[PDB]
Amino acid sequence: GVLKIVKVYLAVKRRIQPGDKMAGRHGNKGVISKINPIEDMPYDENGTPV
Amino acid sequence: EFLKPRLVDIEQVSSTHAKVTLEPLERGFGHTLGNALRRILLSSMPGCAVTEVEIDGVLHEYSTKEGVQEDILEILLNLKGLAVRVQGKDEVILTLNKSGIGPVTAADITHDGDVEIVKPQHVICHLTDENASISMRIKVQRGRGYVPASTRPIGRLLVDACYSPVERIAYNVEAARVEQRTDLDKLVIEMETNGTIDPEEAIRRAATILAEQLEAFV
């Protein structure tokens, strides 16, 4: 009883945002709370931010 | 009264990362100016990242071209890291035409003398067979910060914009035993750019930005 089917494949690209759950390999979870600016992050003696 | 710091040395270690010196500096002003300039540099430095890319036989970035070892997405990712300097025009359109086996690098772009490619060895893609060719148009514009393609024909592929020549900034405050006076600070700022900005020009722009923001109440 169906005449024809049209299947459309969209390809969305989800980058990252607060609320996206991230975890390690040892049962440690967490939802991103802020996409901090690069200049606001902690940096070591060499200036490389974490 | 206060001694005014000034640019005394630009110690070019390599093509990318340089090390400028500010001297003399009073007690505490070294860290203040170092952190302020670090934040300004990492925040707001004009850059010339790619914005749009158009390959002839490509409709969307999730496809492939015959004879190209890389997916279109990986080509766009490689272009996203392309370091380029434009002088006269805020917006330019470079062209890349290559045919034959081998690594299609950034050196195969049309010269366009008003545009400088700082890393000619920057590989863009690989061609696998003689009869395979890539003919593509790249759109390079001036900008500031990070402008994801989502915020801003069906053949145009948008690449995320990364208008930020700086990559790493580190300031060290040392002792400057100069002018027959002790406990004067020297601010050595080591900055690792992508090669598209002059370190002296970068410091000048950062200081100008800070002064303009500070003019609101002085």
Q: What is the domain class of B47-158 according to CATH? A: mainly beta
Would you say B126 and B68 are in contact if contact means Cβ atoms under 8 Å apart? yes
* Residue B90 tokens, joined: 């805020």
Would you say A32 and A18 are in contact if contact means Cβ atoms under 8 Å apart? yes
Closest CA to B17 of B207, B198, B213: B198
B152: Cβ–Cβ under 8 A, 6 or more apart, which residues?
B158
d(CA B193, CA B83): 10
Residue type present at position B13 = V
Would you say B117 and B84 are in contact if contact means Cβ atoms under 8 Å apart? yes
Query: Among all residues of chain B, which has the CA nearest to that of A49?
Result: B168
Resolution in A: 3.3
Q: Are strands B115-117 and B84-86 parallel, antiparallel or unpaired?
A: antiparallel
- Burial class from Cβ neighbours inside 10 Å (0-12, 13-18, 19+) for residue A1 reads exposed
A24: Cβ–Cβ under 8 A, 6 or more apart, which residues?
none
d(CA B103, CA B96): 13
| Count of all residues that appear for chain B in the document | 218
Query: What is the nearest CA distance from A1 to chain B, expressed in angstroms?
Result: 35
Q: Please, which experimental method was used?
A: cryo-EM
Would you say A16 and A35 are in contact if contact means Cβ atoms under 8 Å apart? yes
Closest CA to B49 of B113, B110, B94: B94
Using a CB-CB cut-off of 8 Å, the residues of chain A touching B170 are 43, 45-47
Chain B interface test: which of A39, A40, A50 (most B C-beta within 10 Å): A39
* Residue B27 tokens, joined: 């007690």
Residues of chain B with a CB closer than 8 angstroms to some CB in chain A: 38-39, 42-43, 60, 62, 148, 150, 168-171, 190
